[PDB]
């Protein structure tokens, strides 16, 4: 089955992010939505940057894996 970990999360994942392919795969596989650059306004979380979308919650690749290990959302890191 496919775990529901990132339910409700609309993440902007920059294509230049290290290990981008595997990050998208697992994030999406586990109920996350990605947001296209032109739709940045709808993002709930943003990865890799802090000033691209100030309103969104900033996260790092480490946060994606941390969520997966706990099988739930954890504190933004």
């Amino acid at each position: 089955v496919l775990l529901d970990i990132f339910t409700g999360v609309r993440l902007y994942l920059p294509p230049s992010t290290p290990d981008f392919s595997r990050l998208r795969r697992y994030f999406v596989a586990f109920d996350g939505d990605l947001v296209q650059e032109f739709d940045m306004t709808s993002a709930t979380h943003v990865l890799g940057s802090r000033d691209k979308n100030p309103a969104a919650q900033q996260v790092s690749p480490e946060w994606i894996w941390a969520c997966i290990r706990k099988r739930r959302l954890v504190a933004p890191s």
Partner: protein, 104 residues
């Protein structure tokens, strides 16, 4: 606090395959299709470029499909049920069983 668990291993039966979700889909079927295709290592295309191999559609055959065949003759047109079934059986099923063809 929960103990750290290993990363669930995901099947790769969609690897090397390029999909394009055509038209509109009922309810939450669109992201459901995106989930399965992505989870199992398939590739999703934005436009219907030359890399697209399978065109998923809930709608009936469309004149657009014929035009697309002009540039990409090897295209396959399939229904969402195909991808859903691949997930149930956790294996790559023959798309022919869910193909979409024109109405004579």
């Amino acid at each position: 606090e929960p103990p750290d668990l290993p990363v669930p291993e995901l099947p790769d039966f969609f690897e090397g395959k390029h999909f394009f979700l055509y038209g509109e889909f009922p309810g939450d079927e669109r992201r459901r299709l995106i989930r399965y295709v992505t989870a199992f290592n398939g590739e999703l295309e934005d436009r219907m470029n030359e890399r697209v191999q399978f065109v998923i559609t809930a709608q009936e055959w469309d004149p657009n499909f014929e035009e697309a065949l002009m540039e990409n003759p090897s295209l396959a047109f399939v229904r969402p049920r195909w991808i859903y079934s691949c997930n149930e059986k956790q294996k790559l099923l023959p798309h022919q069983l869910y193909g979409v063809v024109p109405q004579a």
